[PDB]
Amino acid sequence: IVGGQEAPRSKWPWQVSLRVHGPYWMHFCGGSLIHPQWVLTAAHCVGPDVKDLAALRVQLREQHLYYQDQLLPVSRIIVHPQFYTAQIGADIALLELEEPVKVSSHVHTVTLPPASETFPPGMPCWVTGWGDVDNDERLPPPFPLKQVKVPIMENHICDAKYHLGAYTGDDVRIVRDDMLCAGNTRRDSCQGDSGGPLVCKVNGTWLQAGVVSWGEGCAQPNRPGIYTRVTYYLDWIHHYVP
Amino acid sequence: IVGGQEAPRSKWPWQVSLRVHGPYWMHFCGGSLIHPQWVLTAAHCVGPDVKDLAALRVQLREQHLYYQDQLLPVSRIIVHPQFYTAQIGADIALLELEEPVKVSSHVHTVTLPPASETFPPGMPCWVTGWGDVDNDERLPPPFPLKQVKVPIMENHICDAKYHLGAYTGDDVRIVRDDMLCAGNTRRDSCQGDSGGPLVCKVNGTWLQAGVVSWGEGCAQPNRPGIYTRVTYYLDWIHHYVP
Amino acid sequence: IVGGQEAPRSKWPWQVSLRVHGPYWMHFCGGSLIHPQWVLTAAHCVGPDVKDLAALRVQLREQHLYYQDQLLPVSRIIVHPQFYTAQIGADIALLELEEPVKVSSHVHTVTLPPASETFPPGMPCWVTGWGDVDNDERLPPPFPLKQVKVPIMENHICDAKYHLGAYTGDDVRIVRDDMLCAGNTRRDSCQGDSGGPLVCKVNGTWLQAGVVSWGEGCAQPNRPGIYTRVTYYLDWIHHYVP
Amino acid sequence: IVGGQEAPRSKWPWQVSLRVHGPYWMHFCGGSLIHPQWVLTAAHCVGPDVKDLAALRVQLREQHLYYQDQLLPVSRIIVHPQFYTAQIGADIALLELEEPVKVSSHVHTVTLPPASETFPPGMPCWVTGWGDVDNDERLPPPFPLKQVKVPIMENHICDAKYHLGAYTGDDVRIVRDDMLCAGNTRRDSCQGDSGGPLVCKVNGTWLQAGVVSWGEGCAQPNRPGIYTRVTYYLDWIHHYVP
Ligand SMILES: NCc1ccc2c(c1)C1(CCN(C(=O)c3ccc(C#Cc4ccccc4)o3)CC1)CO2
Ligand SMILES: NCc1ccc2c(c1)C1(CCN(C(=O)c3ccc(C#Cc4ccccc4)o3)CC1)CO2
Ligand SMILES: NCc1ccc2c(c1)C1(CCN(C(=O)c3ccc(C#Cc4ccccc4)o3)CC1)CO2
Numbered sequence: 001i002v003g004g005q006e007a008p009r010s011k012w013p014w015q016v017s018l019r020v021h022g023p024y025w026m027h028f029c030g031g032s033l034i035h036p037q038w039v040l041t042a043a044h045c046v047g048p049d050v051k052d053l054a055a056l057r058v059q060l061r062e063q064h065l066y067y068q069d070q071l072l073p074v075s076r077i078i079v080h081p082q083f084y085t086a087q088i089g090a091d092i093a094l095l096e097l098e099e100p101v102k103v104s105s106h107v108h109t110v111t112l113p114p115a116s117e118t119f120p121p122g123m124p125c126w127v128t129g130w131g132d133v134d135n136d137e138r139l140p141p142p143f144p145l146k147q148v149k150v151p152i153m154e155n156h157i158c159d160a161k162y163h164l165g166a167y168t169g170d171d172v173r174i175v176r177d178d179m180l181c182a183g184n185t186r187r188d189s190c191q192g193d194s195g196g197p198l199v200c201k202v203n204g205t206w207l208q209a210g211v212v213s214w215g216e217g218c219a220q221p222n223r224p225g226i227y228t229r230v231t232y233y234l235d236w237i238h239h240y241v242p
Numbered sequence: 243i244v245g246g247q248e249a250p251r252s253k254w255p256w257q258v259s260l261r262v263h264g265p266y267w268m269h270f271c272g273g274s275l276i277h278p279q280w281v282l283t284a285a286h287c288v289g290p291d292v293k294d295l296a297a298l299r300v301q302l303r304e305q306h307l308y309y310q311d312q313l314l315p316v317s318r319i320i321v322h323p324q325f326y327t328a329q330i331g332a333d334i335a336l337l338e339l340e341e342p343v344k345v346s347s348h349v350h351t352v353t354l355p356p357a358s359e360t361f362p363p364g365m366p367c368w369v370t371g372w373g374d375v376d377n378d379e380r381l382p383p384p385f386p387l388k389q390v391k392v393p394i395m396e397n398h399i400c401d402a403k404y405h406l407g408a409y410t411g412d413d414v415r416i417v418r419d420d421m422l423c424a425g426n427t428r429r430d431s432c433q434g435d436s437g438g439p440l441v442c443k444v445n446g447t448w449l450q451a452g453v454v455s456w457g458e459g460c461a462q463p464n465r466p467g468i469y470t471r472v473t474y475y476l477d478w479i480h481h482y483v484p
Numbered sequence: 485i486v487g488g489q490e491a492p493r494s495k496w497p498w499q500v501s502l503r504v505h506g507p508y509w510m511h512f513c514g515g516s517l518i519h520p521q522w523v524l525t526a527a528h529c530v531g532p533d534v535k536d537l538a539a540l541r542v543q544l545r546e547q548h549l550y551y552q553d554q555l556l557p558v559s560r561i562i563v564h565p566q567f568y569t570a571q572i573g574a575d576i577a578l579l580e581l582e583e584p585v586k587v588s589s590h591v592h593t594v595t596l597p598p599a600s601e602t603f604p605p606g607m608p609c610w611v612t613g614w615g616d617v618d619n620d621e622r623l624p625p626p627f628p629l630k631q632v633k634v635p636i637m638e639n640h641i642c643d644a645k646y647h648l649g650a651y652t653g654d655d656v657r658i659v660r661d662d663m664l665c666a667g668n669t670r671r672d673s674c675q676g677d678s679g680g681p682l683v684c685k686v687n688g689t690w691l692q693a694g695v696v697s698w699g700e701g702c703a704q705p706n707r708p709g710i711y712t713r714v715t716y717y718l719d720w721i722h723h724y725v726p
Numbered sequence: 727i728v729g730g731q732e733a734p735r736s737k738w739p740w741q742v743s744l745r746v747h748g749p750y751w752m753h754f755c756g757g758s759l760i761h762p763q764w765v766l767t768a769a770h771c772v773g774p775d776v777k778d779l780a781a782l783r784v785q786l787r788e789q790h791l792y793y794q795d796q797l798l799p800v801s802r803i804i805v806h807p808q809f810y811t812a813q814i815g816a817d818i819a820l821l822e823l824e825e826p827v828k829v830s831s832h833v834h835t836v837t838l839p840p841a842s843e844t845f846p847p848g849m850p851c852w853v854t855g856w857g858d859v860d861n862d863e864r865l866p867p868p869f870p871l872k873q874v875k876v877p878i879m880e881n882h883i884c885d886a887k888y889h890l891g892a893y894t895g896d897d898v899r900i901v902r903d904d905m906l907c908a909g910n911t912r913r914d915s916c917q918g919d920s921g922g923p924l925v926c927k928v929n930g931t932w933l934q935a936g937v938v939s940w941g942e943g944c945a946q947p948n949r950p951g952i953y954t955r956v957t958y959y960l961d962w963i964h965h966y967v968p
């Protein structure tokens with residue numbers, strides 16, 4: 001997370017951390033609890049190569065990374081079959097926890113958007129995670145969860161930003177319909193936030209609009225953060241999650 | 243280059259090395275002289291972001307990198323308009339030298355293939371360059387140009403291989419029609435070889451079948467090297483090059 | 485710390501962590517509380533070059549580095565004037581805290597040895613710290629304080645051990661009388677443990693025998709850990725600490 | 727070498743490169759040819775730990791490292807017995823080549839100084855090598871041999887300077903009688919120059935005044951390069967070298 005600050009303990013109870021086995025269970029991506037037994041994340045976090053589930057754990061909302069881990073095992077990893085790169089799209093996956101979580105006040109699900117929802121350019125959206133605080137700058141110990149408000153930028157506008165200072169034909173679409181742009185030169189997600197939630201408040205309800213997916217660097221000029229657009233994948237999600 | 247060996251001084255007169263301005267003029271990509279004033283390379287070597295022409299130089303065939311440099315300024319960089327990631331394709335670019343080179347017998351052009359050439363398996367093909375000699379393993383000083391003979395694999399055969407050990411649906415095509423596959427677990431191209439020539443001997447003449455483009459690591463199981471297919475882009479090449 | 489295990493929360497209440505200002509207040513050396521207002525540590529942690537007082541802080545006994553820091557400013561760094569390299573000796577220094585520590589049962593001073601105590605082999609001694617868990621191997625988050633029981637040996641055997649497999653003349657003293665040696669191929673202090681305490685239980689009282697100083701690698705054959713022999717410097721210490 | 731300039735191809739015919747076996751025969755220290763069968767270098771380059779002869783090669787003077795290698799095996803490594811740390815001193819060693827070298831125009835021995843020569847300030851002196859060109863900055867390909875003219879500083883003056891901005895007591899001698907000091911903030915040897923020659927033009931002959939030994943960083947204020955004083959060890963050298 002670039003800009004923004006430490007998240008208050010009461011906020012973002014759906015934020016999760018994905019751990020990879022090694023000399024310790026190291027954070028490598030974010031995710032959200034969308035159901036007591038399912039976590040939504042980015043496909044590029046766990047794919048396209050198939051890995052061993054024994055080497056993966058999930059950690060539920062935690063104020064500081066590593067401090068009081070209660071790692072949860074995963075029984076299934078479901079990666080969108082269209083996925084193989086973030087730029088091509090379909091950057092979305094589901095992890096089934098071995099057991100339902102006993103859901104509470106500091107840990108509970110985020111609500112997915114209705115099939116209609118648009119999230120117009122200039123709305124209140126927040127992205128959260130334990131990722132880098134700038135290009136090539138790790139979040140320092142004790143690794144607090146970070147939050148930052150980012151402005152939505154509608155797709156065509158965002159796609160045109162991405163053509164500025166690049167060779168790509170203006171007719172070539174870079175920002176796809178299954179994606180969504182947010183952020184600017186001061187507020188953005190970064191490496192290690194991948195797979196985590198972009199949420200927006202609408203009618204007093206937090207809806208997860210996006211999954212942190214990709215972009216060119218973090219908070220670079222004319223390169224807003226790119227998210228997988230959740231509404232686009234609702235039908236696929238509900239094929240697995242109650 | 244993975245596997246293979248140091249090239250003889252006579253061979254591959256069209257091989258060039260791309261240099262970026264820094265603490266020294268460092269090699270970053272390969273290329274081939276296809277016309278006394280034009281170099282064929284990979285788009286991902288120079289794009290998709292537009293960079294400064296003054297930060298770039300071309301070195302013509304040289305047995306050891308850096309030893310007897312004679313760097314050539316470039317007057318313009320032409321990247322295929324469809325390009326923005328190597329996986330999406332159109333990974334091909336052209337460099338116009340400020341001046342034609344005084345063609346030699348140590349330096350001269352490679353022949354482009356006729357549009358009809360398919361380069362089927364069994365064809366004798368070589369890739370060359372000064373890239374890494376294995377994953378994360380640098381070519382050591384004095385940086386001899388290396389060469390390696392790689393077996394060609396049909397696109398659809400290569401496509402299936404990239405689905406082994408991957409989540410990606412069988413209906414999702416990874417190896418595209420503008421691509422070509424070559425190499426195995428002992429012979430392949432690598433980081434630093436990008437942009438360089440895959441050439442095959444056809445009825446006595448060496449034709450450039452491909453441009454080193456991408457792949458999953460180097461010489462990994464079920465992950466043949468992927469090249470931009472030169473035939474596919476002949477019309478685009480011919481629009482610029484005499 | 486190499487070998488051994490996480491310290492129980494009630495143990496080693498005199499252990500401290502020295503922090504250097506940066507992107508965060510990063511642990512760089514250990515120390516020990518020897519008086520409510522004085523920390524004992526290694527000279528090579530703070531010298532031979534004089535650094536800015538304002539770039540240093542002291543952290544008292546924590547289970548886990550960084551998580552609930554209460555950083556303390558220092559008013560004086562006093563380095564033994566004989567010191568310039570650990571290999572030569574006098575590797576000892578004192579930090580005066582701006583204000584006295586209000587001691588409890590989780591934070592309090594360690595007792596210094598009488599001048600007469602030689603800490604012969606067979607004595608039960610532990611070294612504690614947040615240092616590397618092996619050669620070139622960082623302590624993993626969440627950075628628990630570690631402890632290891634290490635065998636004390638005599639100076640003459642430690643000196644001779646260091647000549648083993650080395651060119652140095654047998655008549656050249658490497659391990660000097662102001663040093664003390666402990667550890668083996670399985671139990672040792674390491675980088676990041678420097679300046680921290682080696683303590684032994686004598687007559688049911690814990691006495692600080694040494695200050696982590698140097699050695700060749702950690703837990704290497706014939707290279708035991710070398711500590712500054714605290715008894716050697718009692719007079720100097722007592723010029724400053726009441 | 728911090729800085730100076732590339733050496734002219736006719737200069738310093740006695741300079742040698744020491745190479746350690748690995749992925750390639752990598753330069754790690756310099757040395758000088760003082761006899762057709764003996765190389766003079768620094769002790770810390772080959773000790774104090776005894777290493778295997780098979781892992782070492784000597785390369786005679788090359789204009790550019792690695793390009794025309796003709797590696798020479800060593801049959802004896804002789805390390806001064808007083809040595810264990812560069813800062814304590816006796817940082818001098820001898821390599822006996824397996825076979826004598828056939829002296830050329832481009833390769834010949836450097837003359838040792840008469841015991842009487844003190845090398846006062848104001849003498850024309852050069853240090854040479856393929857070491858770093860600044861703190862943590864490698865010599866770039868093609869690795870030209872560098873030379874820099876360095877100002878000699880008297881021992882007592884240099885010793886005093888090493889106390890500037892340090893805690894070390896004034897009556898503690900840092901720069902010893904078997905050392906010599908040279909360089910300033912624009913001119914110094916550096917990592918990788920270790921073991922190489924400091925030479926001075928005296929009465930029409932180049933004499934080797936010093937062997938590159940140590941210093942606090944390279945070209946830092948009040949921290950001139952420290953060399954092993956050759957005259958101090960003439961007896962020891964002549965015990966081995968005809
Ligand atoms: N901040 C969100 C954001 C969030 C998480 C995250 C990134 C960006 C990464 C994504 C990949 N990455 C890259 O930098 C990258 C990979 C591919 C491209 C591109 C492009 C491009 C295409 C057309 C025109 C211009 C540029 O940029 C580093 C930043 C690392 O993980
Ligand atoms: N050796 C040719 C080859 C030649 C040059 C070169 C590479 C490979 C790179 C390409 C990018 N890279 C990768 O590692 C990479 C980037 C994207 C993927 C992938 C994939 C995949 C897609 C679908 C199914 C399975 C895997 O792998 C390192 C090796 C670096 O430069
Ligand atoms: N484990 C305690 C221990 C505790 C902390 C610590 C070390 C060792 C270091 C000390 C320096 N270092 C070295 O490795 C080193 C520096 C100097 C020498 C030497 C020597 C020698 C002298 C005579 C004969 C043979 C060798 O070895 C890495 C391990 C790093 O910090």
Ligand SMILES: NCc1ccc2c(c1)C1(CCN(C(=O)c3ccc(C#Cc4ccccc4)o3)CC1)CO2
Pocket residue numbers: 532533568888889892894900914915916917918919920938939940941942943944945950951952
């Ligand atoms: N440029 C010659 C020079 C030539 C070669 C070379 C160095 C210096 C090194 C020596 C070691 N090193 C250090 O930096 C170092 C090791 C020990 C000390 C010290 C000290 C000191 C003692 C008393 C008072 C003040 C400082 O500094 C980096 C530069 C590495 O290789």
